[PDB]
Design a protein around this ligand. Structure first.
Ligand SMILES: CC(C)CC(=O)C(=O)O
Ligand SMILES: Nc1ccnc(=O)[nH]1
Ligand SMILES: [Ca+2]
Length: 540
């Protein structure tokens, strides 16, 4: 009967997390039929005490199938040791895991980097940012990340021992920098940090991360109310939530939920005969599991991934932050408008220049070559004469489009009939894909119309912008044409589909919201020169 060793920080500031994890593990094992035996060890408060628990655990257990460790510091220290002794290793409650041995250590905790990328969407609207972080590799990793992302805005980076909780100094340093947001890299001890900071006159918006969602923090809503934090987006509907609550008298937080999915999946692995470190690692690596944490996907390097959301502390409980959905849509609308504005300016400037050079030849080509470098979302740039014929292009590798008659393209007609700039609908281009063309008219020295200059955007223009914005949030953003045609959707099978073949309202209104089936929908519009696209965000 295989033995799994489980090292948790019982003798430490994170006692409560440790007991939660222990509870969840024991609950999980009782029901699964006990595919393995558990022995618990006390990792203590620092790295040495955890390395000692591991070494002791190895000395005392011959049939040791695996070692599970809680905390970024325990896990980073055990990782190379387990590898050397060829013991399968799982890290839980470990966002700042440092990997050196490829193919070793499976990790169920989403990393600092991913969580930091999401938190940055909120923090970017604060010009003065203070950080107070636990003095261990989780704190220091968050500090180093936040400092890299926000060089100018980060005005203070203070550490604290979570066992000692002597923070009067750090909080003095901090108040003296008049921060706009105070980021706490803290678990439950944040309720005390919050109290003292408010009593010390600090009025800054409090901000935290995954570990901060503890009952202590909610109880202290007198001080913590309004605090915004990033958190895994699993729902409460899983049977584990209720089983744990009924047995132990309180709801399990992240660490319980995580520890329950570890037992469930490891149990199944040890039943199926997987027993070597390589087999146990491969069990997880590349795989998707659905469980109490929701849908969990493991990369080839053994790291779990699952979506996060913004949450906030309120008087009545921990809540999903309503603000994030319109925020993400607006932030995306804004990046798109600024990209379009940049393109429009560059093309307008290029038209001014082509006035003296004409549209053909080496001087024209040079304007085109530069215009393309000025437009990172360009596929190419052309000039088009008064007849609607492409007469020049950069990059020159697309020289075959020269001579192509595009006088029948809808935007080209409009430019010819208005002698004003146009942004096309998403139409099939001679280059071989459905794209979007921005054109400005060109006039010679005497004011006579001589044609137009164009930037054609990349085939994946919208996707390349949108997918970065929505990365790891449980939402989708799509783009619709005025006539209802889908221009961009993360599911490409939908691209090109109409909605005349809430959709009706999206056609006629530039902004809106709605609900279908249960999903919420928000939309706005982006565009130029009378060509507007609808930008919609959906979420549960
Ligand atoms: C005991 C926890 C605060 C540790 C944790 O959540 C982490 O290291 O990522
Ligand atoms: N580069 C292009 C501009 C306008 N229309 C096209 O089909 N291609
Ligand atoms: Ca696998």
């Amino acid at each position: 009967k295989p033995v799994v060793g489980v090292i948790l920080p019982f003798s430490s500031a994170f006692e409560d997390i440790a007991v939660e994890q222990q509870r969840a593990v024991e609950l999980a094992l009782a029901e699964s039929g006990s595919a393995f035996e558990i022995v618990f060890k006390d990792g203590g408060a620092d790295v040495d005490t955890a390395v000692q628990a591991f070494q002791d655990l190895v000395r005392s257990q011959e049939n040791l199938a695996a070692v599970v460790s809680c905390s970024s510091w325990a896990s980073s220290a055990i990782h190379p040791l387990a590898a050397e002794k060829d013991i399968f290793h799982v890290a839980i409650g470990s966002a700042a895991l440092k990997r050196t041995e490829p193919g070793h250590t499976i990790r169920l905790t989403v990393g600092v980097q991913q969580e930091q990328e999401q938190l940055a969407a909120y923090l970017t609207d604060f010009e003065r940012i203070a950080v107070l972080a636990m003095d261990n590799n989780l704190g220091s990793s968050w500090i180093r990340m936040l400092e890299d992302r926000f060089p100018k805005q980060v005005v203070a980076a203070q550490e604290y021992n979570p066992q000692q909780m002597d923070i009067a100094a750090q909080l003095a340093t901090i108040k003296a920098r008049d921060s706009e947001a105070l980021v706490l890299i803290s678990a439950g001890e944040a309720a005390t940090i919050a109290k003292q900071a408010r009593q010390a006159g600090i009025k800054a918006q409090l901000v935290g991360t995954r570990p901060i969602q503890r009952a202590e923090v909610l109880a202290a809503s007198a001080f913590t109310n309004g605090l915004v934090y990033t958190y895994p987006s699993y729902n409460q509907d899983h049977p584990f939530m209720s089983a744990f609550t009924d047995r132990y008298g309180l709801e399990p937080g992240f660490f319980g939920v995580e520890a329950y999915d570890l037992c469930t999946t490891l149990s199944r692995a040890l039943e199926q005969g997987r027993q070597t470190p390589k087999a146990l690692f491969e069990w997880y690596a590349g795989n998707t599991f659905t469980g109490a944490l929701g849908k969990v996907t493991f990369a080839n390097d053994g790291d779990a991934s699952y979506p996060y959301i913004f949450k906030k502390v309120t008087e009545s409980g921990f809540r999903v932050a309503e603000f994030q959905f319109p925020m993400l849509l607006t932030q995306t609308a804004q990046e798109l408008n600024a990209i379009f504005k940049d393109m429009d300016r560059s093309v307008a400037a290029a038209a001014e220049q082509l006035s003296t050079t004409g549209l053909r030849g080496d001087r024209a080509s040079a304007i085109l070559e530069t215009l393309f470098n000025e437009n990172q979302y360009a596929y190419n740039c052309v000039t088009v004469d008064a007849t609607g014929t492409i007469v020049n292009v950069a990059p020159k590798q697309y020289s075959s489009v020269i001579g192509e008659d595009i006088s029948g393209q809808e935007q080209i007609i409009r430019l010819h009939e208005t002698h004003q700039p146009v942004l096309s609908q998403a139409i099939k281009m001679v280059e071989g894909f459905v794209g979007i063309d921005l054109e400005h008219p060109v006039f010679d020295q005497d004011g006579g119309f001589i044609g137009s200059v164009s930037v054609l955007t990349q085939p994946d223009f919208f996707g390349s912008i949108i997918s970065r914005k929505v990365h790891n949030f449980p939402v989708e953003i799509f783009v619709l044409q005025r006539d209802g045609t889908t221009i961009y959707d993360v599911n490409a099978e939908e691209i090109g589909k109409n909605a005349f073949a809430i959709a009706r309202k999206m056609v006629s209104q530039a902004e809106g919201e709605g609900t279908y089936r249960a999903k919420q929908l928000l939309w706005t519009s982006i565009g130029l020169h009378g060509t507007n696209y609808r930008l919609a965000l959906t979420y549960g």
